[PDB]
Amino acid sequence: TEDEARRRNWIERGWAPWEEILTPEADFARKSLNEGEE
Amino acid sequence: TATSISLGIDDLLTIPSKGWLVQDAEQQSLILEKHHHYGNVHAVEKLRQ
Amino acid sequence: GTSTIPGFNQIQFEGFYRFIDQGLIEELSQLVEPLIKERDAVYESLTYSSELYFIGNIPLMNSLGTFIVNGIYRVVINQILQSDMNHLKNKRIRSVADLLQDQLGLALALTTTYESFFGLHPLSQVLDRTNPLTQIVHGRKLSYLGPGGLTGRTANFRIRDIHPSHYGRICPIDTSEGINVGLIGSLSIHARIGDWGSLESPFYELVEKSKKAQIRMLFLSPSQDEYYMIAAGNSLALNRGIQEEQVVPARYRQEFLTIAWEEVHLRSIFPFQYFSIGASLIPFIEHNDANRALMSSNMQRQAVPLSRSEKCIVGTGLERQVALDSGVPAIAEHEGKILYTDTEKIILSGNENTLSIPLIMYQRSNKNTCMHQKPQVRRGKCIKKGQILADGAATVGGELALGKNVLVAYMPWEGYNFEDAVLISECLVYGDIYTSFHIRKYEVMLGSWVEGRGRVIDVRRVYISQKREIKVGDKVAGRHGNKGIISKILPRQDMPYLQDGRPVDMVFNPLGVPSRMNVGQIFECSLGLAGSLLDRHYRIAPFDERYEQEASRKLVFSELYEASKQTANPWVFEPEYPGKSRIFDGRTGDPFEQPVIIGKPYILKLIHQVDDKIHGRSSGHYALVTQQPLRGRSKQGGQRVGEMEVWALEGFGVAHILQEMLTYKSDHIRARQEVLGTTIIGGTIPKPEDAPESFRLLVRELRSLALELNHFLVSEKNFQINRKEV
Amino acid sequence: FVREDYLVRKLSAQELQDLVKGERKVPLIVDFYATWCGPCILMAQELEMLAVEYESNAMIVKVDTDDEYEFARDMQVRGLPTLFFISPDPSKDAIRTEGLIPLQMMRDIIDNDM
RNA sequence: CCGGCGCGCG
């Protein structure tokens, strides 16, 4: 499930949700591609 | 025969605005390639453009 | 082949040596030189083979890469087969080394089986000796057919296509025409066969500072071709940044990119890397559509050696390589001095070693083309080992010379160049510009004029020479896919003439350029004229626009102006319309209204000509079973009226024309004899009313399957049933 | 069975020293060259032609400056291509020619000075 | 005067 897989990733693979400081273009690409193509 | 149509290198007429239009398309392709490298567009968006 | 173009026969040469090296030992799990000379094997129809000690005879490969069996030159061609199925990394190439060693596997389980291998195997073919170009390109073919290989019906539609792994290994232009399209390949100029049966091409490595990299030229098998970013552009670009982030087109992972120079691993720098020999002899090929490049390569292989040969004013620089690797010219095997020269021999002496080199004088090819050699050196000239001594047929000064430089205009002339017809001048006829010697063989006093009319030149087998001047119906072509049939020959006073008063030799239709899209012929004709006036020859590598935009235009226009200025011929370069000039009608003396592109291109004469295609038949011999007229010009046979021709006659409603060609012109034995008699007396031909021998033949065959087929006539008068004899 | 393609032999500084010290009957021509030098290709072909010309009447040798740099500097070599024409008579003095001199110039030097 | 194989032209 997507609660134990994340814990396993953290413990065994060093995963951490580090903050990605994005440019306005990358932020717009992430926020706008979630809706659709055109 | 009397008129004697022929064909030279000069007669092959490119329209005057080809250099203008090719340069604009090159400028747009250069800009999108940089922003694709930035991660601002994805591969399909670059391929379509 | 790291720094020069490799020998075109190096693949055959290396393969045979490998077979002698390890193939003989690997199969036997001691050879003596052949007693017969190579010339003697073909002269009296033997096989050039060496003895193995007495196990058998092993055929020997000539330095040109061809074997001799029963006095017949033979070539062993390479095969492609399965090692993304169409990826070249999943293929292997079997050379003569694999084919000769494999037959040794069958031989040991010699003389007879090797004799039957060259005679019967599809991959063993008779060497084409039409011209020096055909001798070398035959040995570099790649085939998917042959034993263990796919048939044309078996061929998949995804095969026959261009795969990106072919770049630098298989020429994307050269292919066979017809059902075998895309299945007969051709090796590239710089291609090489690796140790794993894969094809390799050389690429220049760009590597970081901290690396020795003694040799930066390394060959890629197609398996490792994918994982390199290979660029074909140049580094002549600078902006306010620095050179490393300038972008160039590149290849990576079967697709084309545009990345910075700092991300490029390898560079494609050889000019002839991606093409075969045929496509590498086309000047200004980058201005011709690739469709005509395939046909141009085929046409160059049909060129007839002319009785007198001359070099092309405009070339690519590969003519010298073709001449050297064809074996047609005489190449010195020892340094020394020239002491004696004549038609029959050349005497060379060096380091207390004096050799005598015989010269070929009017010999016959497999394609009825003459071979001849003339000295290229004088007495008292110092010679290095490997330098030319004499010039062969279709070879001048150590270069391939398949055609002539003639004055040419591109204009319509009264419909005599309609579609693809060519109008020529009488000067090409009485000047012997396009005269070729042709020799047949037939299995009579020497020097007699037999009456196929010709002069008997050699008796052993009778050889008859035929001097063939250019004629109406002959085929001529340029090196840009521009073919044409000669339809009219005019006196020199009738041809259009230039502002210097010189009449042109050929007139070409200008309408053939736009539809065919071969602009390279316009470039070559203009530069050929400039070179003739400037006493210059040009050898230009393809894709010259890599230096600058319109590089070919700058070269042709500037050389045209140099010829115009130096020779004081203002019509040669016209500022108003460069390359074109106003010419005059030879019949009226009045100028043609528009300027005409003129020049001196290189035009070839092809084997396809009249005197080998005109056929006529009245009657004669018929087949034994079908009783129909024979098939073939050589057998004096008739023309077939196929089912599509029968449909046309039925569409016209000509029911009596159809019956003529169905009964008493083909197989009605009784009615064929009466037609022969009535026409000589002119006494009306009656209807056959009986069945032709093809229907009676079918009835008997159906009888052999226990089936009876009877033809009955029911009278419309008294309803009596009549059984027709069949 | 197969003749060699090149008649000009490459010698070391010690081998050339022994050749000059030893008795000589024919003129000795010493070439100083480097494979990275562009003009040395044309000189190489010219000297091959000259060696073909003088079968046994002259000796043509070549010294690579990438292996005998100090030896070349000692012999007063200021650049490439550089040729040294050494007469068989020890009394006479050798001639050093600098540049891509013509083949006829080499023939004249050998005939009228060695 | 029979068939296979190879190469071509339109």
TrEMBL record, chain B:
In plastids the minimal PEP RNA polymerase catalytic core is composed of four subunits: alpha, beta, beta', and beta''. When a (nuclear-encoded) sigma factor is associated with the core the holoenzyme is formed, which can initiate transcription. The chain holds residues 51 to 99 of 1373 of the full protein. It comes from the Eukaryota. It is found in: Plastid, Chloroplast. This is DNA-directed RNA polymerase subunit beta''. Belongs to the RNA polymerase beta' chain family. RpoC2 subfamily. DNA-dependent RNA polymerase catalyzes the transcription of DNA into RNA using the four ribonucleoside triphosphates as substrates.
UniProtKB/TrEMBL annotation, chain C:
HAMAP family: RNApol_bact_RpoB (MF_01321). CDD domains: RNA_pol_B_RPB2. DNA-dependent RNA polymerase catalyzes the transcription of DNA into RNA using the four ribonucleoside triphosphates as substrates. Coiled coil: none annotated. PROSITE patterns: RNA_POL_BETA. Residues 125-193, 637-712 form the RNA polymerase Rpb2 domain. Its main location: plastid. It is found in: Plastid, Chloroplast. GO terms for biological process: DNA-templated transcription. NCBIfam families: PRK00405.1 (NF001616). The gene is rpoB. It catalyses: RNA(n) + a ribonucleoside 5'-triphosphate = RNA(n+1) + diphosphate. Keywords: Chloroplast, DNA-directed RNA polymerase, Nucleotidyltransferase, Plastid, Transcription, Transferase. This is DNA-directed RNA polymerase subunit beta. It comes from the Eukaryota. The keyword Zinc does not apply. SUPFAM superfamilies: beta and beta-prime subunits of DNA dependent RNA-polymerase. Its EC number is 2.7.7.6. Residues 332-635 form the DNA-directed RNA polymerase subunit 2 hybrid-binding domain. GO terms for cellular component: chloroplast; DNA-directed RNA polymerase complex. Belongs to the RNA polymerase beta chain family. GO terms for molecular function: DNA binding; DNA-directed RNA polymerase activity; ribonucleoside binding. Gene3D superfamilies: 2.40.50.100, 2.40.50.150, 3.90.1100.10, DNA-directed RNA polymerase, beta subunit, external 1 domain, DNA-directed RNA polymerase, subunit 2, domain 6, RNA polymerase alpha subunit dimerisation domain, RNA polymerase Rpb2, domain 2. In plastids the minimal PEP RNA polymerase catalytic core is composed of four subunits: alpha, beta, beta', and beta''. When a (nuclear-encoded) sigma factor is associated with the core the holoenzyme is formed, which can initiate transcription.
